[PDB]
């Protein structure tokens, strides 16, 4: 219901382009039903419609030698269509079957040179002499009139959509040389395929925009109100202007970019002129877009704004935005990094109300971005982008370009032995036999400082239930509070119950109090914001109410969140605790959490989970109906959960065959969920030791017979190999002593025994 | 060695298994017992940088601003990997606040807390190893002796017989000594 | 090249970052990898940074243009901004150039120091020129400051001063090289 | 939230209740504004408000007895379709 | 050849500084096969390599009286090659 907007809406004439074995540009390969479906009269001209209206046409003939949904052309028409193989084009005869009147060609020097001759006699008469080789007005095409690729430009043409150029078309031969890179200047018009890490945040743009531009009639006549301001924001460098250009050029809308600092880099009383002349031709041309880039540089908060000539640009921007009326059909979108930095007067209604949120790309966004950036490099076989995408943690949609850059430079540096320092004779195989390995990528990854390691990460976790096992009751009582009020809302209206808005875990430290939150967040495909202890205790050592509001506002825009306030008691135990001083738990921060937990509508699906190592010293003000209401007690792992934890820790490392985890978990009784992760690491540092010792001992050994030539055994220790756990179990420490697990059992038993109405039975 | 050298000289072995490198140690022992000469000695082996972070300067942060320099100290080591950042006298704030302060304050002290924020926000790929050193290994905040942070404790005992011979021959290097001095004897009574 | 001492560790990084983009323009444009749009050296004042820029550019065959800090911020309000333009305009005309904007923490301080309006109109005039650079111009700007956070944070955004070397205090064996450079004219006695 | 008979000594004034007093006195009775408090610890409340001219009397709201419980149950069970054979007159008679 | 660009191409005919007692400012004392390797004929001038493009060239004669490892030169060219005795100098003909 949310991301159903990218439907393709196929038409019968959609055929996937393919390669043609003939240099002829006017070859069409059709399915037999396609020839007689659109009544394709042989010899005429059919209109081929690509994307960005990048188009080039062909004569339709009886050539069905290819597949049913493929069409064969050469590089001229296909490349002028600017769509690869895997993109369909509606082959459809538009009745503009006409010849051009006058065309002007712009030759490109390197393509034209070699065989040059005269433009007309060699390339324009015979290559267009009744040969039915058609071209589109205003293109940059390819002429196979010589020994190799020769490219021109279409400038003037009587049939604007498409035409065949004939000798009747008088062509001026004063064409000037053009460049191969000059095509890239125009092709800086980005397609829609070049955005990664924004599978979700681009559906919102496709629904807010792309409807009120492709059909002004619909939304204008029905009386609905289209947006007049979108405020994209995220960490710096996630490529937001790229998003704006994609959304604009993809829907045939003029895109006018207003630079951020380029406004105030000008004289007093001159920047206002630029804002006016931008908003006054954007309204002039067409359904347009203004992308006011780097907005927080021309409209800060009041405090950073100092003079008056700078609080005049802001007011000019405001009076220009309120000059937008429904006739104009213009849509403004800005780009700050956080919503706070912008001037608060702009967020008022009618100016910048709706507010999309680009964010740090997630575990698959990085993969897809890497695939975008590495479609030009020549990757070696052993490169596994799905692997490196898992490594890069804090990187954004810009650091990955630099990572690719560093890897390519690492290869070009390992270009070492046998090409001279000034060897301009760099063989083409140097540019086409590059082999970037995992070595280069790991080298680059070890050198890049990530841009945004200090941002909260809002992404669905990748844990499952069988990484904990057991907990068969907490499982259901945590389902009934995060899954039912999401997947089956109508039940909660059929009856009268209001969904709860919190749960408070409590138990010994290190027992799976985080894996449960992550697991339940995974279950209902819900984002997972985690707020650890230090990130709160820092608030208690200075300001409050300036970040907690931010945390909840961040959670609101990612419904359904499962906010996990780990170590709620942290302040209470860092302020003495159970002795402390004069205080009724009296916290500067927790009170703010209460204030924001009341002013929160239940309809938004933001469930708050706490976790306290101590269930009593906490403030009693939260354990009151309307807030975190009931306490779940997370016991120590008992039998199945220990097997599951061991098999989830030992899933990354090669284990032997006789390693009896079903016995190892059967022996270790009172072990935490984080003391079975040091019978599983300290059992690996006894293998790293042994392998890295055997290697060195073998290396020193074989210098006794350096001429043996029979050395380098494939593996001395390939395997964790039981009799390591025999030793690693000698440093296994029980974290929670039996004198400290009493304090929780003798609490949970006290929650009971205050219950049990038992013999209660309604009469008759 | 297995904490500063192996995760540097043989990083490929750490991928064959799934082990993740440790990012901390905590020496503790009687005061003035070569707890600093062990940070330098290992830093000399793997040819690593060595940023030394003393007591009288951490305690400066607790007497004013914090949390604006601890961020920078780490970001200095990140641009100079592989470091062996050595937070000398991690307890310095704790015993300068009361040593189980009377008013109640348990562990958090506005500076040791800040180290936790940076220590967690540091990917293990960068080869930065944090080494503490304390003489009061009980008042140290229990929030750092937890997995993911400074993990274990190594107890540096007093020099016994063989180090004392070597310690003497290190101090008596620049000074022309007589040839009939018996450091093998002088190190056998000093016990 | 050999008139710089104590920087052999960092001067290697400038080797990888600059000469390869400058002495082999086609290879970068052919493969498509992108050279840096600006280096940002930083270190304590007087470590000979305005020499390193000359070192790199005077031996790689590349025109060098020096923009001083106080030279810009001491002209008539509205005339300084012109001088910045007539530097980037002139350099782009010439060969692969190196603009070394020395004393950058003077023409672009933290906002918390900028108070005048003309004081914040040079900074914007700098940013538009910087991001105005693209692969055609083949220019590589590089700056100098004493401490990285003493610069306007709007400059470190991607595309302006992305990568950032760190010249540091010379080490115990670096000084021996410097002393052998400043005393190659003196008549030292044999002792 | 200050100590409940704080140890350092502070008796009644707390910088906020004092302001409530200052505003409460400076408000003519002609305006028809009635100030209702509510506390669960009716001894630590500042003795400077239980004085004539300010919040004067105290009313002790007891636990629901037998009829208020029936009404409370029938008020909570209004939006949820209930069975017709449920005896709230019994469920309110056992819960005591 | 896709791992190769860092070559400096040290040459078999690289000539190291050797002192001379002559006063002619363009006389070069070369190895015997110097005229022979690149088939360096008489009547041209070589392009001696210094630094910073600050070089100084000579007229190359069939004067191969030196040894096969070094070049004997006066102060003029080697110093006007802006390189002290101790800098690499490479020999290469220039048809200019």
Residue numbers in the entry:
A (entry chain A): 12 to 775
B (entry chain F): 490 to 680
C (entry chain F): 203 to 393
D (entry chain B): 585 to 680
E (entry chain F): 12 to 107
Lines from the paper:
VCPIP1, first identified as P97/VCP interacting protein, is a multi‐domain containing deubiquitinase (DUB), which harbors an N‐terminal OTU domain, a middle UFD1 domain, and the C‐terminal UBL domain.
To elucidate the structure basis of the VCPIP1 and P97/VCP interaction, we reconstituted the complex by size exclusion chromatography and determined the structure of the VCPIP1‐P97/VCP complex using single‐particle Cryo‐EM. We finally obtained a 3D reconstruction at an overall resolution of 3.45 Å. Unexpectedly, three VCPIP1 molecules directly bind to the C‐terminal D2 ATPase domain of the P97/VCP, resulting in the formation of P97/VCP‐VCPIP1 complex with a stoichiometry of 2:1. The partial UFD1 domain of VCPIP1 observed in the cryo‐EM structure folded into 4 β‐strands and 2 α‐helices. The residues on the αA and αB of the UFD1 domain of VCPIP1 form extensive hydrophobic and hydrophilic interactions with the residues on the α9 and β4‐β5 loop of the D2 domains from two adjacent P97/VCP protomers. Moreover, the aromatic residue Y623 plays a pivotal role in mediating the complex formation in interface 1, the side chain of Y623 pointed into the hydrophobic pocket formed by the side chains of P626, K754, M757, and F758 from the α9 and β4‐β5 loop of the D2 domain in P97/VCP. The aromatic side chain of F638 inserts into a hydrophobic pocket formed by residues R625, P626, Y755, and F758 from the β4‐β5 loop and α9 of the D2 domain, resulting in extensive hydrophobic interactions. Furthermore, no nucleotide density was observed in the nucleotide‐binding pockets of both the D1 and D2 ATPase domains of P97/VCP.
